[PDB]
Amino acid sequence: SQVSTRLVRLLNMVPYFQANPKVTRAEAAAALGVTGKQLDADLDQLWMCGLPGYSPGDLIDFDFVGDTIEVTFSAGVDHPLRLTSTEATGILVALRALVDVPGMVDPEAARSAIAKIESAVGSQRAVVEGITEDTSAEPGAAATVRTAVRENRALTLEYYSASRDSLATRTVDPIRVVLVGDNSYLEAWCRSAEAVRLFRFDRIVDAQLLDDPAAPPPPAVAAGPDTSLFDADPSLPSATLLIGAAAAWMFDYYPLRDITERPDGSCEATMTYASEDWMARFILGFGAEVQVLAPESLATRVRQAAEAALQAYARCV
Amino acid sequence: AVSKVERLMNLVIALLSTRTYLPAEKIRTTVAGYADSPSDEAFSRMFERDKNELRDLGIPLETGRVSKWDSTEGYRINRDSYALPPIGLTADEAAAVAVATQLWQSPELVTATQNAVLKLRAAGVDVDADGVGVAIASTATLPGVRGSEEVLQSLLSAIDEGRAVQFEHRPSRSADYTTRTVEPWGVVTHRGRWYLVGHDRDREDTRTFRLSRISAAARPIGPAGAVQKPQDVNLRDIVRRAVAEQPTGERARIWIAGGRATALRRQAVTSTPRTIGGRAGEEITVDIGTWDRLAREIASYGSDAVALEPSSLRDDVVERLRAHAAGGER
């Protein structure tokens, strides 16, 4: 319960103070994630408890120098408590989950951390394991992105826009790196369009470092971590489409809305599209599995595109 | 008047600082907090409850005999087993841990990760998250991490306890739920997707289940220690095999107009320029893999991509395009 965690924290406080000789109040509060009054009460409670006998030279006593904390007699408390199975398993799971995400953490650091934690806790091959012992799938652009984020230097990115299906070379300045679903996006301010955009790592062919350490406007204007300006907007058009039973692939990787069930397969769903061409390609991909319902203009455009493709195939050989 | 936390701290300090086993009566007499019990039975009950709590907190108590000339049982705490070995952490590892400590959202996992990070920091290293300046945006829309959070916790607990699991799994939304009882072996992640590896007790085969499909009812059953997975089995290799079976299918020649189909351009194996029907582009010889996926990719681009060989794929694309061009009646 709460008492158990409090006891663990109060027992592990002593080695933390022994490691850092003159840690202040604010640093300790930030490290242990507790309020000032709670920290003071815990420290005072730890002050009056120690080795049996309860002589003033037999219990743990501190040495308050102004607003600094130092240990003069630990009474045998020299090392922190071990790691239970649950917490170590959770840490290992998180570390092995973040090693495959591109750009959020250096894979070498993650592997070194995994090795050190396994050696410290004595874990074996009966724990969670990744797929790639050595990825080598990093093109080096992710490392350049991380370096630019750390050093606040201008970057040149060649991004593949799937909605317009093109390659655009832009000069952008990073702001922060965020994780959305299973696709981490680098957030950057672009002066070509002068806007905050989220670029996906797998869509970046290569990155170029440049010697233009210019502070982006958003830090001087507004630096909201989210900035979901068009992640979900009502202005985004939505097409109403009928989906067959066999075509269940799109039911998982895309945000279908207003799902209506029908044994006859006459009830449909609605999904938003950024561009008309993207939705047309998405519809044409599934073939007869997906039938167009609304809008009528989109259906006419899809029919015209299909007729043009049929004519092109007839002409070609 | 001694608080519970103070009593437990005194007890653990007294046990740690003694090199000889301590019987119950000595603990009652010496350690503070055990001198206010109105009766011996009440003291015994309180001491047993405290020892159960301390053992539950992971502290490795050892029970033995005081000496070869005495028989009363005594208690001790090993100083070697209680102390984790020292570890040296660089800046990169500290940054990695600081980034990874901000992923979970379940209160139990959050508490466990916080306690682990506190112990790691108290070990001597300095883990700081503000230096990197990387945050997490999505916390309630993830289908792998956030969506598969409670199920993963239940699976991890069952694996730790060495017990089989019974749950409800469906291959797809169209299909129906099926009750599956399997003995788990571990959890393996691939492309940021979890995949539970186990042996089914209803089909007797090694199966990998995507945690997104499974609902939250991951009920643990079976006695503890009844699960003995083979050590020579490599879970990651099985996961890799299950991810993809068809290596390359065949080699297909597809014509694509220049300047477009960049996603298909990246997938090109060999290319050769050619102009057909007044439109220039490149004919590429590529792999097949999943036939339906390649057919969808070809049909998406329409006139931009023209299939040449094999003829079966061209016929399939033509049939799908004619079905689309029928007007939606069928």
Residue numbers in the entry:
A (entry chain Y): 2 to 318
B (entry chain X): 2 to 331
Sentences from the paper on this structure:
Here, we demonstrate that the binding of single-stranded DNA (ssDNA) to the WYL domains of PafBC activates the transcription factor.
In our structure, the WYL domains are positioned diametrically, forming the broadest part of the heterodimer. In our RNAP-bound structure of PafBC, the previously proposed ligand-binding grooves of the WYL domains are oriented toward the WCX domains. In the surface representation of the refined PafBC model, a distinct tunnel is visible between the WYL and WCX domains, extending across the entire heterodimer. The arginine residues (PafB: R211/R214 and PafC: R201/R204), which are essential for ssDNA binding to PafBC, are oriented toward this additional density, substantiating its identity as the ssDNA ligand. These observations demonstrate that our structure captured PafBC in an active state, complexed with ssDNA. Although the overall fold of PafB and PafC is similar, the distance between the WYL and WCX domains in PafB is considerably larger than the corresponding distance in PafC.
